[PDB]
């Protein structure tokens, strides 16, 4: 394995895996049979166990964080002499520890790899997500000690993001790894396109309705936007208010909006999701292989 | 040579504007020199021009939305000056769109049978303009239907932003895909559903005795409620022979679901490579429009 | 006496390759020629007349009073009664045509409910119209139910005339094929699951509004249309069992609805394009034969 | 020779009851002599025998349903038998249903012992046997609780009733369309529903915990309440305003919008598409698995004389 796994300066694994999202063929090169076998071998040797241990630790940490937050009480609040309070505060100090740990992990990531500042928002989505969670937790701490009530919003954002972050650990399993890859591809392509078009349609139709509406609760653009959105989730009322003239034009706008959005653009989202799944099978598999390779190399460098 | 600018007739000019009846409108655009020259001219000036046009139109739509939203007819404050200037600007923009629509109609003189198959965006812009002008006429005649004509114009204007996707590739292809369903499998797939809905609404309203759902409008709307995930199944109790009522409702629900299902199996039984060709064709049309319009 | 065009078009379903034999150059050419010459214009007129009949019947049914009822001498009421008379004449005509078809083509009891779908639909709508009349003259009230059933089947049979245009005829062919193939199995399995979970839930419920098998079944089915409640009763014991059962039913019913909405595409993303077009061609050929035999 | 009539080690029986590990236990049965033999024996006697079994099963399940739905509701079981024709019918229906439960329990115990399975693929293969054993176990524990003077006999009975009513799909085999429909159902539950449910449960628990943390207190201060409220979206009955006993409406609505966009918009339509590809990919596999299931039915009946 000369210049294959350990050169300490520049070797094939480090350049292939850590190459930025610019190389034309950064995915199919790992499919070389000896290299595939080598990665799988190192995995089975120790990386599988280290990843399982890390996953168990992360799940336990997030359970602790959920327990501490779910029982949250002008902070800070006095530490009452009761077992529940001691356990709550001990959970809080563990959560803060996790946040600071991820804050340093992201810093070390960005310093050791030092992306070119351009493809920093094109790859390494997991690391930026973890850094953002860490920042949310830190800002929650800062507001908590500053005697403000926005620390709840900060930490709930942190908690939701951290819970959704367990998708990171789906890698290391063939089936769930490919599933997570497909989810991410679909988010990037189909969700984005449909969301842009649908946002334009919804804003236009809500503006038309609110202009028609004379006064009342839905005279606000926000109220009318919420009402028109409630159609896409199978909850459209179609008669939320009668405070306006010319029932005809109101119903015409509502029916045109429903036909163009609910029956046409949703059917279009589903169809693109079908086409993509039928198209990017092997691409998803290669991306999963590369994700596992990056994890293996990192944990190998972590001793 | 006589392909880019002949000043009398060029291949790009004739291929761009050849009617829909021609068999291979977008296929021959794939010729190497045509593709390369179209791309060269686009990336030379049309991209910048199109970006500027899209920005101007978006700003205009924001202005018109603000003016219409804060409507106090007909009808010394900074807010009052902003509203009135917004109204004036919106009217002027509608007039300009009227002008451009008339100009295109006269120039291409479509055959009134593909006039609707082609120039879909042009027809949409013209109809927007006709709504705005009628809204002006009603407003200055001391009437109220100006609000209906304004809201329709505003809705079409905001939903017409999709014409500007051309210039962004993936957004252009997605927009081309939506166009296909509306101008091919929308009328046809909607006539069947409409006849089902009308027939079952007539059956139900006949079955009812009397109530707040005596009219055809209310019963038709109730039967439509199911299509939007709001099936009530009990809206009226004033009747006789409950079993016939409920079995008819179940029949309608199952049939409408199967109809939607057949819609999906039919249309999902798209193009991908043809859509890219369509988008390239529309981008080329934009390129020549910018070139001649300078 | 015996022509390949009339023999094959009316050939049984026992023949293997009807959908193919219409591809023969002379046959398809001649069928298109006859259509475009005369049968297109005859079919257009026939569709016009049928739609006018349906409008008349709809108007008559809508304004029904609240039998027989006395006629008050007003022009609108004379209009109503003559509408009802035209509606009965058309129903009788459809009944006569159905009986004539059954006494001419003698369907051999095997594909009788597989092919000739439109003819059977019209015949059953005739059986509804005539039984409605019989109830009406007998001083009975069920005539309203029979009449509404007939009206629903008529407006739905409107689709029979969708043929003569390729795209709409092919979509209608897809609807018929779906109804005869896939909704069958989907509804069998869905009914089994719905009844099982309905019985479980109603057994769990002690008493109340939703204590009957019928009300429980309705509340359960309400989930398939995205109008679930998940809390429609509380007069019982073991809320845990209630929630477990409702969650299991919701999960399984979505599995089933999905499995269908996918399996139909998976099986027939392919055959629809060509087989449905061939079937539409066959249906147009049969229409040509019927029109010609009607002179 | 020694294909189906060997009595020492027959290839047909060996392959039909073979280990799961066998690479192509489904493909080998397609051999023309094997398939011809299976079809012959089926048509000759197993068709009639299996249809009679289906009829008896349906009759048993109707009797049990009628007995349960008409149960006496008075508390503290058992209940004294009151002299009435209807009551005599309702108690004999009960005693027949109990007998059926015991019969299925013994059938399962027999399959378990006779087969001597691997204890590793035992769950992976033979889902039907374990499911029937489970309904029988529920029924027997329902009898025990009924005699033990408790109120959980009804819970055990309703679970058994639901499981048995859904178990009629075991008989879908023997009809090509519904057999292949059931096998596709089974594959799709094992793969696509499992993946989607893993991701969806993670997402739902995370966002529901976040919301219930945000919610100050009131009706929805319980984790279960917020979990149900969030699950109401995926069934197409979300509210978006079910609670207002909190602060910072901005964060609340942002969390709800994120949850909706991530689950309802994205993961459900991904389920659509993934199930589309799957079904478009695994047709012949389902056909072969159904053929093997009918083969196992035929062999079991033949050994049952
Ligand atoms: C902030 C917004 C982020 C939005 C991005 C979408 C979420 C998804 O990010 O990426 C999935 C996963 C993988 O990332 P990775 O960098 O490690 O992989 C990359 C990746 O494959 C890429 O092709 C190559 O660069 C190379 O293959 C490999 O290097 O990352 C996760 O673990 C998050 C998944 C869990 C979060 C999903 C929630 C939805 C995302 C939007 C909301 C985010 C906040 C919650
Ligand atoms: C432990 C619990 C795991 C639950 C997973 C779901 C199991 C399931 O669903 O498989 C239906 C089953 C028939 O599999 P089979 O054993 O016959 O198939 C196998 C299989 O194919 C194998 O590959 C071949 O070796 C060969 O074919 C054969 O070995 O049972 C039925 O006959 C349908 C009955 C359908 C009802 C069962 C599902 C009900 C869901 C919950 C119901 C809630 C009720 C309350
Ligand atoms: C009075 C009768 C009702 C008239 C319609 C009222 C105005 C509501 C909006 C009508 C929707 C028309 C269809 C539409 O606006 O979407 C199509 C475009 O996105 C397609 O993209 P593009 O314009 O071709 O570039
Ligand atoms: C005999 C039981 C009591 C009467 C209840 C009957 C419930 C049916 C209600 C009438 C509508 C049935 C129409 C139908 O069966 O679905 C649509 C047609 O298939 C479409 O076929 P086609 O296009 O007309 O050829
Ligand atoms: Na709903
Ligand atoms: Na719904």
Residue numbers in the entry:
A (entry chain A): 384 to 456, 460 to 603, 627 to 712
B (entry chain B): 385 to 456, 461 to 463, 467 to 603, 627 to 683, 688 to 712
C (entry chain C): 392 to 457, 461 to 603, 627 to 712
D (entry chain D): 385 to 603, 627 to 712
Q: What's in the article?
A:
The capsaicin- and heat-activated receptor, TRPV1, has served as a model for deciphering lipid modulation, which is relevant to understanding how pro-algesic agents enhance channel activity in the setting of inflammatory pain. Identification of a pocket within the TRPV1 transmembrane core has provided initial clues as to how phosphoinositide lipids bind to and regulate the channel. We captured several states of TRPV1 ranging from channels in which the VBP is empty to those bearing different bioactive lipids, including distinct phosphoinositide species, brominated phosphoinositide analogs and a pro-algesic lipid, lysophosphatidic acid (LPA). Together, our data show how the VBP accommodates a range of bioactive lipids and how occupancy of the site corresponds to the structural status of the pore.
To visualize the lipid–channel complex, we added LPA to nanodisc-reconstituted TRPV1 and determined a consensus cryo-EM map to a resolution of 3.0 Å. Through symmetry expansion and focused classification, we captured LPA bound within the vanilloid pocket in multiple stoichiometries, ranging from apo to all four subunits occupied. With resting and fully liganded structures representing closed and open configurations of the pore (S6) helices, respectively, we examined intermediate conformational states associated with substochiometric LPA binding (the four subunits are denoted as A through D in a counterclockwise orientation as viewed from the extracellular face). However, when the second LPA binds to an adjacent subunit (A and B), we see that gating transitions occur in the S6 helices owing to ejection of the resident PI lipid from both neighboring pockets, which communicate by virtue of domain-swap architecture. Specifically, we see that one S6 helix (S6-A) is in the open configuration and the neighboring helix (S6-B) is in an intermediate position between open and closed because the resident PI lipid in the C subunit prevents full backward movement of S6-B. S6-C and S6-D remain in closed configurations. The binding of the third LPA induces all four S6 helices to adopt the π–α transition, with the S6-B and S6-C in the open configuration and the S6-D and S6-A helices in intermediate positions. Together, these observations are consistent with a model in which ligand binding induces allosteric gating movements in the adjacent VBP through domain-swap interactions.
